[PDB]
């Protein structure tokens, strides 16, 4: 299938990107270099991942080598929760730009709808372990994101982990200047997200699926959790197509008109994961994979469940 999807800012976004959460700083430079060498043109980053400097070393070296041109890359980062304040957004974006070695981002996302108290800690806590909120609302944070477009720092802005009512709040914002281009959400066969995806797509917002392999390296994994990569039903579909389970899990969101961002630091897997443009899942395969939904989430924190903007109390 076609490699890029058209966004509502008029730019094209590669439907396959490389994830970088948990990629160790001593491995991620080589991972990104390999990824670019084997065809990746989209890298998903974030300040909170603590490895943007090292991602940037790889990007800058592949630009210097003229393996790629800057206009052929699609670099995404995200505004962390402790920077939702009007006066902090530009500096947060600039720190990311400096670290990534870039003079603009292709896409900058509000990482989570929950704003936290600014400071050095990424998760400021009270003495009982609840996150300490900011009083800055999502609409004022969105206005600050719009400024970044108007200053040339970012080509597109979007959101991540927003539920449909939160997306709707953005879309209904008085004086809205730029619609979100993307909502980046968790999505895989155990969390299929039909309702939220349909809503976003109906509004022209492109959905990016994160943790498409079920994030087997997530730090809070428990032995009893379900495992996509080991699910015999998914392995069977992969065997029928002579592809790996990971390749099926990556192709699945692609055929739903989603962008997908599998993470790896393993060179062989980085290359394997890109070899997904040359086979098709049938409609029956797609519906079968959708049938595995169990509303199982990788990402979501106990410490945030009383924040006024916690996204996962709503059904979708
Ligand atoms: N917006 C958000 O709030 C948010 C939240 C979560 C994730 N994300 C983004 O989405 C990206 C992907 O999600 P994720 O990192 O949670 O997990 P994931 O991509 O679902 O899974 C990554 C894990 O799968 C392994 N893996 C990769 N390719 C494989 C293959 N072909 N065969 C077997 N195992 C394979 C990786 O191992 P190795 O690396 O050891 O090869 C790693 O342990 C993140 O890195 C981040 O960029 C965003
Ligand atoms: O948020 C991501 O992209 C992946 O997960 C993390 C990555 C990090 F580097 C550090 C922490 C997380 C993490 O716990 N992320 C989960 C998370 C964050 C913020 C708010 C909530 N919430 O439920 O409202 C959940």
UniProtKB/Swiss-Prot annotation:
InterPro entries in the cross-refs: AKR, Aldo/ket_reductase_CS, NADP_OxRdtase_dom, NADP_OxRdtase_dom_sf
Active-site residues, Swiss-Prot/TrEMBL: 49
N-acetylalanine: residues carrying this PTM: 2
Location (main, coarse): cytoplasm
Modified sites of kind N6-acetyllysine: 95, 222, 263
Catalytic activity annotation: an alditol + NADP(+) = an aldose + NADPH + H(+); all-trans-retinol + NADP(+) = all-trans-retinal + NADPH + H(+); 9-cis-retinol + NADP(+) = 9-cis-retinal + NADPH + H(+); 13-cis-retinol + NADP(+) = 13-cis-retinal + NADPH + H(+)
Enzyme class name: oxidoreductase
Gene3D superfamilies reported for this sequence: NADP-dependent oxidoreductase domain
UniProt entry keywords in alphabetical sequence: Acetylation, Cytoplasm, Lipid metabolism, NADP, Oxidoreductase, Phosphoprotein
One term of GO molecular function: L-glucuronate reductase activity
Chain positions of site Lowers pKa of active site Tyr: 78
Tissues of expression: Highly expressed in embryonic epithelial cells (EUE) in response to osmotic stress.
Functional note: Catalyzes the NADPH-dependent reduction of a wide variety of carbonyl-containing compounds to their corresponding alcohols. Displays enzymatic activity towards endogenous metabolites such as aromatic and aliphatic aldehydes, ketones, monosacharides, bile acids and xenobiotics substrates. Key enzyme in the polyol pathway, catalyzes reduction of glucose to sorbitol during hyperglycemia. Reduces steroids and their derivatives and prostaglandins. Displays low enzymatic activity toward all-trans-retinal, 9-cis-retinal, and 13-cis-retinal.
PANTHER family assigned to the protein according to its UniProt record, in alphabetical order: ALDO/KETO REDUCTASE (PTHR11732)
Oligomer and partners: Monomer.
Official protein name in the record: Aldo-keto reductase family 1 member B1
Organism whose genome encodes this protein: Homo sapiens (Human)
Name of the encoding gene: AKR1B1
């Amino acid at each position: 299938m076609a490699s890029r999807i058209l966004l509502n800012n008029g730019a094209k976004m590669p439907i396959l990107g490389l994830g970088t959460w948990k990629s160790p700083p001593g491995q991620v430079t080589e991972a990104v270099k390999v990824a670019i060498d084997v065809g990746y043109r989209h890298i998903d980053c974030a300040h909170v991942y603590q490895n943007e400097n090292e991602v940037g070393v790889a990007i800058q070296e592949k630009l210097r080598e003229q393996v790629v041109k800057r206009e052929e890359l699609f670099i995404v980062s995200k505004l962390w929760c402790t920077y939702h304040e009007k006066g902090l957004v530009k500096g947060a974006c600039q720190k990311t730009l400096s670290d990534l070695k870039l003079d603009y981002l292709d896409l900058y996302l509000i990482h989570w709808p929950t704003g936290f108290k600014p400071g050095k800690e990424f998760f400021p806590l009270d003495e009982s372990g609840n996150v300490v909120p900011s009083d800055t609302n999502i609409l004022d944070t969105w206005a600050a994101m719009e400024e970044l477009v108007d200053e040339g720092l970012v080509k597109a802005i979007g959101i991540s982990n927003f539920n449909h009512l939160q997306v709707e709040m953005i879309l209904n914002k008085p004086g809205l200047k730029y619609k979100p281009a993307v909502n980046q959400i968790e999505c895989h066969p155990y969390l299929t997200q039909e309702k939220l995806i349909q809503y976003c797509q109906s509004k022209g917002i492109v959905v990016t699926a994160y943790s498409p392999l079920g994030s087997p390296d997530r730090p809070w994994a428990k032995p009893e959790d379900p495992s996509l990569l080991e699910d015999p039903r998914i392995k069977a579909i992969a065997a029928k197509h002579n592809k790996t389970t990971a390749q099926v899990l990556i192709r699945f969101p692609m055929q739903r008109n989603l962008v997908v961002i599998p993470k790896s630091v393993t060179p062989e897997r980085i290359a394997e994961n890109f070899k997904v443009f040359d086979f098709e899942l049938s409609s029956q395969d797609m519906t079968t994979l959708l049938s595995y939904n169990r509303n199982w989430r990788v990402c979501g924190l106990l410490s945030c469940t009383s924040h006024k903007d916690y996204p996962f109390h709503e059904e979708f």
